[PDB]
Amino acid sequence: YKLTYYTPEYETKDTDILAAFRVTPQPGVPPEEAGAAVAAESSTTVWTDGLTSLDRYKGRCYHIEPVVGEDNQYIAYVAYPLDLFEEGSVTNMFTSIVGNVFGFKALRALRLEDLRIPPTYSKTFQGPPHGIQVERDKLNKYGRPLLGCTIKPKLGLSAKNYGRACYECLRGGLDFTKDDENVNSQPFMRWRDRFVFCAEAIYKSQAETGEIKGHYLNATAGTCEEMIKRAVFARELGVPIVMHDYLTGGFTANTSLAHYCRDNGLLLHIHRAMHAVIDRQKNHGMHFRVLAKALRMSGGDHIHAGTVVEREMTLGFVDLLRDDFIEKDRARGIFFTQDWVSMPGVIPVASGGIHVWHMPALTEIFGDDSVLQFGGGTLGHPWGNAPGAAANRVALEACVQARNEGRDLAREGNEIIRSACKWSPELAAACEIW
Amino acid sequence: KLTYYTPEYETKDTDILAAFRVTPQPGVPPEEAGAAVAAESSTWTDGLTSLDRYKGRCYHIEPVVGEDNQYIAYVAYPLDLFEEGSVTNMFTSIVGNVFGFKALRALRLEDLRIPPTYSKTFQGPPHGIQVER
Amino acid sequence: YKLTYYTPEYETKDTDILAAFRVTPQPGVPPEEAGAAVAAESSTTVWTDGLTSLDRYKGRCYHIEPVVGEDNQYIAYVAYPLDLFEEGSVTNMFTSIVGNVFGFKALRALRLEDLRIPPTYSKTFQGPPHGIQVERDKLNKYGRPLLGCTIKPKLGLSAKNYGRACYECLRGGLDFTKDDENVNSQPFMRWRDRFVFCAEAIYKSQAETGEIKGHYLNATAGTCEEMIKRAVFARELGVPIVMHDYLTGGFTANTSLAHYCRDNGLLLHIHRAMHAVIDRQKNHGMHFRVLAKALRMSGGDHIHAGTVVEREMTLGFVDLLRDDFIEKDRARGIFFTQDWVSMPGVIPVASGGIHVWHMPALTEIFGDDSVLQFGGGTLGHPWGNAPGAAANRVALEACVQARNEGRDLAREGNEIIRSACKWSPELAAACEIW
Amino acid sequence: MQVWPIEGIKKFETLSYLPPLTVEDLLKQIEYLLRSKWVPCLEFSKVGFVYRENHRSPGYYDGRYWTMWKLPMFGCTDATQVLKELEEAKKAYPDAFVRIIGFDNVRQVQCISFIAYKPP
Amino acid sequence: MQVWPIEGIKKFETLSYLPPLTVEDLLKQIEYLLRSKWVPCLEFSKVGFVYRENHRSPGYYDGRYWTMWKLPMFGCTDATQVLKELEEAKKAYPDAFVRIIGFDNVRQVQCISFIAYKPP
Numbered sequence A, C: 001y002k003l004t005y006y007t008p009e010y011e012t013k014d015t016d017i018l019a020a021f022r023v024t025p026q027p028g029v030p031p032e033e034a035g036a037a038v039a040a041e042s043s044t045t046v047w048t049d050g051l052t053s054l055d056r057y058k059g060r061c062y063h064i065e066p067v068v069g070e071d072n073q074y075i076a077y078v079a080y081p082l083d084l085f086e087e088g089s090v091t092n093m094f095t096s097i098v099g100n101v102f103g104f105k106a107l108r109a110l111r112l113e114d115l116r117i118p119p120t121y122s123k124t125f126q127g128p129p130h131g132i133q134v135e136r137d138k139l140n141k142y143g144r145p146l147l148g149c150t151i152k153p154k155l156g157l158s159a160k161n162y163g164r165a166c167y168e169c170l171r172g173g174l175d176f177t178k179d180d181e182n183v184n185s186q187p188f189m190r191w192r193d194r195f196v197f198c199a200e201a202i203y204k205s206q207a208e209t210g211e212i213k214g215h216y217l218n219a220t221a222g223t224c225e226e227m228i229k230r231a232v233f234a235r236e237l238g239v240p241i242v243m244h245d246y247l248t249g250g251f252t253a254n255t256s257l258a259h260y261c262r263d264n265g266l267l268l269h270i271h272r273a274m275h276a277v278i279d280r281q282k283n284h285g286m287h288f289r290v291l292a293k294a295l296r297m298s299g300g301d302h303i304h305a306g307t308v309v310e311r312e313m314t315l316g317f318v319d320l321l322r323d324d325f326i327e328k329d330r331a332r333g334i335f336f337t338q339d340w341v342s343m344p345g346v347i348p349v350a351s352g353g354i355h356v357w358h359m360p361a362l363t364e365i366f367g368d369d370s371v372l373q374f375g376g377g378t379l380g381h382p383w384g385n386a387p388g389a390a391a392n393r394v395a396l397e398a399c400v401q402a403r404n405e406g407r408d409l410a411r412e413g414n415e416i417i418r419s420a421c422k423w424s425p426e427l428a429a430a431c432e433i434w
Numbered sequence B: 001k002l003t004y005y006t007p008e009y010e011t012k013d014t015d016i017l018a019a020f021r022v023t024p025q026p027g028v029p030p031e032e033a034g035a036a037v038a039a040e041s042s043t044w045t046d047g048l049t050s051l052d053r054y055k056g057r058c059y060h061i062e063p064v065v066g067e068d069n070q071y072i073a074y075v076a077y078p079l080d081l082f083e084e085g086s087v088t089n090m091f092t093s094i095v096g097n098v099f100g101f102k103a104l105r106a107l108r109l110e111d112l113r114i115p116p117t118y119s120k121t122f123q124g125p126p127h128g129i130q131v132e133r
Numbered sequence D, E: 001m002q003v004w005p006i007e008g009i010k011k012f013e014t015l016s017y018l019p020p021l022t023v024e025d026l027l028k029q030i031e032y033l034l035r036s037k038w039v040p041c042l043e044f045s046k047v048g049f050v051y052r053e054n055h056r057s058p059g060y061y062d063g064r065y066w067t068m069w070k071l072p073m074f075g076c077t078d079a080t081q082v083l084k085e086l087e088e089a090k091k092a093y094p095d096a097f098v099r100i101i102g103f104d105n106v107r108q109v110q111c112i113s114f115i116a117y118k119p120p
């Protein structure tokens, strides 16, 4: 029934989990009907229904409106009761909300845009093993975005040659180096060997520079036993941070890892491999912000957030990832006011074709609480990894200094970089190739 | 195309093969789209190894009958790229990054040729049809 | 039936495990019949046969030819289906192929010469805990064969006096010292005491020379519980390498040890005690190359490969142990093209009556990826162990330098050594006694 | 092609990769803190880098904490006041490193740290 | 009978047991790398030996990695070019050890390492 499930006068409860769906009904399906279907098919005739009160377990579409997106498209708001969800289980939340409704015939397409996670539910999750503040304090780093570099080539390098690249990058000024998402354990490089050599690299660069260093050691594995075995050895090595591909590994496994990291003081870097399979298309799937909120709940200290070179949408989920209270702002993809009631924030990681000239914009857009992850941006420096890292570290600090003085990074970006090239041969050499 | 488009490559019995339904952006030739799918889903430090030995490669491209601007690109991935017994790593390696490539309007993985050499590293069903019966 | 099991037109499958048997039929037994028997008796009338398809589980002789070996001798090729073997079990492979057929009355003698291990089967084995490349990187040793010495006398020495010999040998230039195969744990020297003193020796020599040192601590034991207990203490001591006699200890136990070493970063030196009981005679048994492939699969970082002072046969299984792809070459005992699909290689160990004058030939024949294990060759030096080790290290490097310059070690060997004697009193003294 | 130095260029996090700051540039950074409503504070040490002596477990390092110079300058509105304390510290401890940090009562946390003086 | 020295003869693996190489002998080893199609690279350090500071687990050692001098000399066909870099390194870091290593893109690995210079 449209009005069993379509309740336009329903007032959401502070304990409801709310969802904003972008719905594309099939021809001949009224919006009210589509909305009701979305709610009904993602929630609740058989005699057993008489042994309880279905009304207290049904999801309900309390609002639907034509959207400006495209052809016969609408945003439907659905409210789900708190009791439907298993405490601390992102897996069950996803299963309950997006487990079945996307295949409904009456819908040509469907995409989950946002979720309002009430305090009564979020409080049942540990959340980030540490969070932005704790991480800065643990690593003793303040006043600037963090810097990192992904080791290349992806596969093919020996564990030792891999560590060599790590050391050179780190000693040059980067805070972190990182295992590619595909690097777990393979014939050309078994994981334990990589952990050993990367540990030597981490400590060599730290002793040389005097600054705390780290390398996101990928613990992503085929099984939970293997995943933990890798985290355990990193723990033995005393390194500060490990890594996991939460989507390919899965939420059940990620949550377990997040708990291990909390119990052992390990920072957890989260890569979002395979997200585009789900969040690329505007008409169907789940927008990344939903996957981002899910990660903050399941647990992660860093999370890849994409590149900056749409901006407003990125800034939108960045706030959803770092802030305690985010006000409704559909212009930035925020369909619901979100209150995290003190759950720690996650540091967003920007990566993808970024180089020294992008430093002003990146610093400007993300602010200090971010990680700027380079690739060839550092490994492609004509003088090698150490000079490349130095060029990026110098470029970044030049931007920070200028911003702190009140200069406009968005307008004076190029001059700030050009000016820094005067006293930094490394930066100058980088600005000549890019 | 590139280092990535090798239309006469003979797949190895150990290669993991993928069939991608690719929808190129306007102005992106099917050959380039295919090479891109292979490159973006696989690959001074390159001098310390062999890029060819670890590159994914599009060995065949064909249009989709009845579809506008839609093609099926076949890509071959060497066995060494995958961690044994890990479906997680297989997904990460093949679909972890390529679906967001700007040169592609849309992308769908249609099938995967799992070579016996790789499947033998998985336990598989705890019991299976016959045992269950 | 000859043609149920003798299938000369059968095309081997890429998943079959192939075997090359040297068969000596009894008088009156046709070669086709002998071949069929070998296949049938090493594989597959009762009503139960009707509950399946015996054809898919039978081994088959697809080729037999008179061999040049001797009197009524033939090489029979047998193909076994992949499904007959338990994944990752060398024990089951041996049981399935050589468990019963050697006692068949119709055969006067039988010897397994080679095995074609398909990728589909080899991929189910961990293989070497580390392998050639990883070992070189872990120990930071490149460009030359490794050097070691077995402590003598075999038995009778106290644990401390044993360690004393270790230290002196190692400080002189050798990379390793080693427990005799018979040295496990006995009244005159209990294992834990030996591990303690050898550890002191390893670290004393390393600190003195600045080069990474090791001592193959024998973990071979009467039970798997004892074997692991010894590996565990070596792990606690932080030493780089342990040892096992895989044939006397057995494959089930060796595989477990190989797994422990992989999980704990320990190199595994493999001694082949008792191999001659099986691989000495050309008419019956199993050629060492089969035992070698078996070890690479079960797991080992080093494996004894014999001395060089028949050559072609040795070189044959050396390639089977180190390379990724070995082409068929019956002249070198390689009956099947073998592809290891990236399984790490094992370092071959040459030992047995070798001294300084043999360095040119050994370096020439084995190349850099080998371990040259001496005995009296170093312990018999007139000035003691340290000078003996120095003489061997100098002799080896002199050979490497000359080879690198393009000189012919096979023809200029003696001159190269004589020339090195000019600046090395230690080498000179060694060249006077041998 | 220039090789990045292996010694003599130890660092102190944010801003330590820029050339030595002048008095004017230093004042600007201090003003940044004041305008941001953050509380400046000086810290000093004769050991300028992190190390691991008491433990090597994840996240544990020695040498992160330095010694506080007096107290956080609450209610400071004149950046030159910080410079004055910096000069006193340098006089009392010329052989010590001195860094300027900032605190936010809003974020309830340390959010700034940059070197201000290094001994000869 | 001569007693093997306990000090002053610390080693650097392959070739370190031979007398100091002359410029000609050094060139020959470099040529060996070039003819073998391997890529030469220089590494330097003020600490010339392995040690164990951060861990003592099997296979873990500190001091194995040294610092890279510039980059691997890809496409090098003139051994004297390596000598030139060796001389520059010695000038920039006379109090540092310098070794020559080689890489193979085929074996995808480091396969060479020999000392080329030791400080006074």
Ligand SMILES: NC(=O)C1=CN([C@@H]2O[C@H](COP(=O)(O)OP(=O)(O)OC[C@H]3O[C@@H](n4cnc5c(N)ncnc54)[C@H](OP(=O)(O)O)[C@@H]3O)[C@@H](O)[C@H]2O)C=CC1
Pocket (backbone or CB within 6 Å): A150, A272, A273, A276, A304, A305, A306, A307, A351, A352, A353, A354, A355, A373, A374, A375, A376, A377, A378, A380, B040, B097, B098, B099, B100, B101, B102
């Ligand atoms: N020397 C040369 O030949 C040159 C090399 N390059 C340079 O090399 C460097 C490579 O590193 P960089 O690109 O920074 O980062 P990485 O290649 O490490 O990629 C990091 C992230 O970028 C995104 N990404 C990159 N490729 C794609 C793709 N095919 N489709 C979708 N998303 C993609 C992904 O983001 P997410 O996980 O968020 O989806 C990925 O996680 C750059 O600086 C590049 O400009 C390019 C030109 C010249």
Ligand SMILES: NC(=O)C1=CN([C@@H]2O[C@H](COP(=O)(O)OP(=O)(O)OC[C@H]3O[C@@H](n4cnc5c(N)ncnc54)[C@H](OP(=O)(O)O)[C@@H]3O)[C@@H](O)[C@H]2O)C=CC1
Pocket (backbone or CB within 6 Å): C150, C272, C273, C276, C304, C305, C306, C307, C351, C352, C353, C354, C355, C373, C374, C375, C376, C377, C378, C380
């Ligand atoms: N001072 C003196 O009185 C003299 C002492 N010696 C010298 O002492 C040294 C002893 O050490 P070394 O011989 O190098 O090595 P070991 O005695 O340590 O033996 C190592 C390997 O040699 C092989 N081996 C040795 N003896 C036999 C045998 N009886 N039958 C079969 N194989 C055998 C085995 O190889 P595998 O495991 O591969 O089967 C064994 O593993 C030599 O240099 C020898 O010349 C001899 C003459 C004089």
Ligand SMILES: [Mg+2]
Pocket (backbone or CB within 6 Å): A150, A179, A180, A181, A182
């Ligand atoms: Mg990556």
Ligand SMILES: [Mg+2]
Pocket (backbone or CB within 6 Å): C150, C179, C180, C181, C182
């Ligand atoms: Mg022995």
